[PDB]
Design a protein around this ligand. Sequence first.
Ligand SMILES: [Zn+2]
Ligand SMILES: [Zn+2]
Lengths: 263, 54, 394, 49
Amino acid sequence: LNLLVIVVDANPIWWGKQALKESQFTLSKCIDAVMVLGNSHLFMNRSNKLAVIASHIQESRFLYPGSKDGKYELLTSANEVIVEEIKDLMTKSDIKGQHTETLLAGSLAKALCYIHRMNKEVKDNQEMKSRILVIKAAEDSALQYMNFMNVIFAAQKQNILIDACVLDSDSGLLQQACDITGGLYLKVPQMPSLLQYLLWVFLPDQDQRSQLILPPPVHVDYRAACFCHRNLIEIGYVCSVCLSIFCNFSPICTTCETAFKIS
Amino acid sequence: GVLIECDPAMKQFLLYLDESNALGKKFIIQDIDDTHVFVIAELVNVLQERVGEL
Amino acid sequence: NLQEFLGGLSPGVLDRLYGHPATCLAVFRELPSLAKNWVMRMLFLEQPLPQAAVALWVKKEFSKAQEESTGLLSGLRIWHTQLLILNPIFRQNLRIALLGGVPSLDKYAEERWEVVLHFMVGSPSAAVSQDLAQLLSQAGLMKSTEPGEPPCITSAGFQFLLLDTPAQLWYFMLQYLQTAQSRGMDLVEILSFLFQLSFSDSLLNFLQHLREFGLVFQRKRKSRRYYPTRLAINQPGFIVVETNYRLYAYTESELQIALIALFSEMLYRFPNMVVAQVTRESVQQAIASGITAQQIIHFLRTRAHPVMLKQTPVLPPTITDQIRLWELERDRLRFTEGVLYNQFLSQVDFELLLAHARELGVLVFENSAKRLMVVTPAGHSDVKRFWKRQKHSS
Amino acid sequence: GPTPITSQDIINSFQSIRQEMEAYTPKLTQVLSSSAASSTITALSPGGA
Ligand SMILES: [Zn+2]
Ligand SMILES: [Zn+2]
């Protein structure tokens, strides 16, 4: 079976900027597209299961743990729960000018441990191939690099595919993240037609991904820079404690304070 | 006729009954090859009794 | 299989059968691997797309999956070339199906199927039902020929008996549908209920027959609501086989003992065990009745005690080989109707006549060395005319 | 690490997005359109974007 997790980056600052701009695309339509993708994923098979996470500057919250219109009961419950919870989360939110960058590493950590919990609980008879369909919507924060890299490596070890679906911006950190675990990287330039991209590129599971034509991966610039002025460097002088990429040979690296002996 | 598929070594088993039975003119009417014989329709159930000795 | 059953249908019945509630989902689950993905893709498109795209949308490796899926779904007629947009009705129904618009039961099903099999075999005590008896008789696995005397069991009956419960029930329901069309019950309406289970007068009669089979049980004096059993949606062994053709079966239900006695000689019957011997007499008796060694071997393997599961193979080679050799020992006569010509003159002329009886379906055996073609009397008035025409052509 | 790189705007965006989603479940027609879907398929075509 397959356990899909949609990590939606519903950043109020950026999505409300779109709302003020009165652009055609809106967070409501984005949530509807994600809902349709999840419904289709579960539609694929009974054993398949899904979950949803929404990201905010403060924290990240799960959007998912009759036939009034002649509807499938389970998908109806999914629609109702996600709609109600997303509206509640968006309506209620404190204001903090100091912190405005969208948070994604914590949401991904929650997704990873949730997948681990489900893998533990599920019977050993059936093998579960989990996936994380990250949908970024705003620029990333520099200060989150370390934790995001930790969670990416944990996902690599635990065999989960991070399929990035960044839109309106190309996050180098996120493309690097999905490249490590082999997840696909699609940058949709046509936001209104986003759902067609999901039902082709992302929706097919790892089982059938190899035996299918999908957009080629984007080249990843594995840049390195010294800790002084933040610029690309091809040669780094790291020590045996900090393991920090530096500018030039120095008597002692500041982040270490070690008694380096010249020679 | 009645097409009967059999074994090459067993085809001559029904031929011996042809020269022994005096009911009609001739039992086997057309011997196609070694695994196909023909017959007036009437002795398949009787042949099942001879399986105990065959 | 259900794929065969659905493939053997016309477009007119197919589109009607694609009902809104369940059919669009039940037939979807059938899609083995990839056609699911394509159905989801082009579920939201109102514009048909070229076939070349679908052709090139699978890598060079594992293309046979692409062709087989495309052929299967073309047979199902989910889309039309229109020049590959899906059928509008199926698209709408599938969108409506995708975000749009027990312990006693299993025992009941087991007991009902067991009593049905008891009646199938010559059990003096069994459930009595004239409709069930006549249905089984017309299913092709039973023939009575005398209403006063209880019906006997035909050759196909033993083969059906020795099959496993899943395949047995599935084939029984397939025959049920085929005979439903003959008796006049609408096929689509009854078929849709089976799909709806895994999630009118004709409906009531069909549900009554299903309850008689034990798949469903209203439990409320035949109320509208029903609670399907496990078998409606669609175990350890007990026989121990020795190397001396001896079977020790931990059987308490008389059905298993009867099934074993069908092809073995019973020696002792203990309260929780029974001893039988697989001898030439019993095995050849079963083979004459109609069974073949494959069914017996499969039955013994599936009902294999856990003790003998450790050894590989589970069933001893000596027992398996002996059963196969015993079945081979018997080769049997056949029955057909035919007429034979002779004095065929030219050789190249006899080869043209062989294609006349082969296309019409009246040819049985040919002989190019003696010129000897057997023609059934059913098509004798058509072959002779052709021969006369050939003679006229000269 | 080495990876490289008004106030009233946040208030305006927050209130606007709060008022955005008073209506939900527009999936019937709003989420997708055939013309946009066809454009997406053409883009996914080898010669497309
Ligand atoms: Zn520097
Ligand atoms: Zn250091």
